[model samples]
Target: RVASPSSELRRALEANEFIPYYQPLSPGQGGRWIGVEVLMRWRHPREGLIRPDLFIPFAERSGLIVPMTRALMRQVAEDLGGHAGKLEPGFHIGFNISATHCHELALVDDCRELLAAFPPGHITLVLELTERELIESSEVTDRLFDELHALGVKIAIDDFGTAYLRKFQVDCLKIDQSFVARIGIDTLSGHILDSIVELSAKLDLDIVAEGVETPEQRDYLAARGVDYLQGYLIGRPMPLESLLSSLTVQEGQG
Candidate 1:
């Protein structure tokens, strides 16, 4: 008899130890709050501030991400769902889901409950696909996504270089930060970034730029017609209340 890390992980997740952190997202025009991407931060009992990369892969390997994702969604419902009055209509929120949940099919109901949490007001729920395992698309899986789409949910590809051409297609693509990081310093990468923008335009999909750290990058990305911007330059991932306060405080303006 012994304690497995996965066992401890489950306890912490349900106990509110693995908290949700939100990094703000905004239109490329800038200075106005559009929405946020829901991120996970874990607080271990003995060690503090565990990196997601460390635990996330472990969780995925053990299939713990399924429940772990569920807990965060529930936490978000508790945190932001009750405070929709503070946010304007059509406020968008994103949740990064791994390939694991796609096959589970329970994600549809999870999403349904999430949107139902905010009545009357509309919040666009985007499920950002985290690329690790290639999705095993089947008849059942296609039906699952079709069901989600019926609820006005959109699928987003995070850090798009290329993904397998599957039956189910993505609605939007997020530009990887590595491309954004090379904006001014690297000439070839800057060109690649431009092509990515062009590709997004041709595909008729909304594009979000990530890891923007400076005004120069922000300005260039916006001026180039990137649909959204997110990074430390805009805002850091904050606790739920901090975001709630920020949204509530800005209810009157912009």
Candidate 2:
């Protein structure tokens, strides 16, 4: 059930209390850290950290998402900033954007401005679009997307196989790819995900399957020609510092 919004929740966010944690998605085939998906975590001083499921709807209803998204963008840049001159050329950082943000051209402009501050090729922030939202476009939407595309930002469609939207391959723009969830796990093969992989491969599209929680799942997806694998089985969500530390430790151990 949706909990009644306590003013305290609003106050906590205003007090700069909510924390964002990043879940790294390596995809594991390559020899480098591909990137991370920024997941929001609410850290309560007395109540410990909470999940976005507890507060995201409230934030949306309250119209706090604009600032919240800007903050997220800044945090992402800061994370990349720390690893500057060290990360690979095409390190991707994946995150979701609200449908409202996409429809409004100004939001895309703001994103472009933020990205402009970052060095080119270092931060490849891929803003994800949901299947349902992408299909509901009008002329205005088309122009908005053209402008966004011109910004040289990467785009992705999230949760590829689950949506019943019936759109055949995401053929609109040169989309980076899909950040798929629950592949070969809750559902088996010859199902929606298989169709996704088949279409994506036929089009030479890259698909990164997330929620691959088992070796069987990863191997199955990989063997079937899915491009990248991400889940707890590959790497858990770690603090940015921890990610850096892990690399250092691995090098030392080697």
Candidate 3:
């Protein structure tokens, strides 16, 4: 159940405490980091760092999601613009888009404004369709996806196993970590995950195995030729400055 969000959420947004924490992604077999997923967090004045699960549902229920998303996009654009020189060219930054954003046609224009801050080819944007809300199929919705595609944004399906699978125009598949965690332990889930890997190949979509936290798990997915790997074994979600510093350390070691 979503707790009732009082005026504190609104105040937090106005104070700019809601921010993005990035988790790194790498190619299989311990490859260099290629991109980062931008996850939201509320740096509560009194509560410290608050996870999205705590406030997102409340925001969605309260109709504050629209404004929250706008603020996130603006902050993201500013962060990316300020740190452009530190990021590698063609680096991808992915974000989760609630179903509400998909319904609001204005989302297209807002994304366009944010994308304008970075030079073309310097960065790539990946929009992960959230399963918390269903995307209603309609002419307007179809057009928004088309516009997003034309604008060079790639689409992805998030938390695949727990969510019902639907055929949509998408570029990537993130096999939920639960399935990843089950590898070598549960034969059934392993077989199911294998099926997903096979399906991704048939569809020619990039597949990322999420929540992989062990050498065995990483090696298993690597052997399967999964395109990308993300989980604690690689790196945890961290602030932008720390991520940059980590990247620098990796570069120096290389």
**Candidate 2 residue-wise lDDT, 72-184, digit = tens:** 67766666666665555676677677666665676677667667656775577677767665665433555666666676666667776444333432331211223233444
TM-score for candidate 2 = 0.80
lDDT of 1 by residue, 1-254 (tens): 98677776777777778778999998899766889999999877788866566667778788889888888898888888778887678888898887878886688988988988897447988998744433554445467778888888888878776335355566788998988888899788888899989988988889999898999899989988999999999899998879988887777575
What's each prediction's TM-score? 0.91, 0.80, 0.91
lDDT of 3 by residue, 132-204 (tens): 4434533344577788889888888888766234436778888999899899997897899999999899888
TM-score between model 1 and native? 0.91
Clash totals for all models, in order?
0, 0, 0
lDDT of each: 0.82, 0.63, 0.80
Error of 3 at 244 (Å): 1.4
Arrange candidates, best TM-score first: 1, 3, 2
lDDT value, residue 110 of candidate 3 = 75
Badly placed stretches (over 4 Å) of model 1 are 131-141, 162-166
Models ranked on lDDT: 1, 3, 2
Q: lDDT score of model 3?
A: 0.80
Please estimate how well model 1 matches the true structure, expressed as its whole-model Cα lDDT.
0.82
Per-residue error for 83 in candidate 2, Å, reads 1.9
Model 2 steric clash pairs? none
RMSD of each: 2.1, 4.6, 2.8
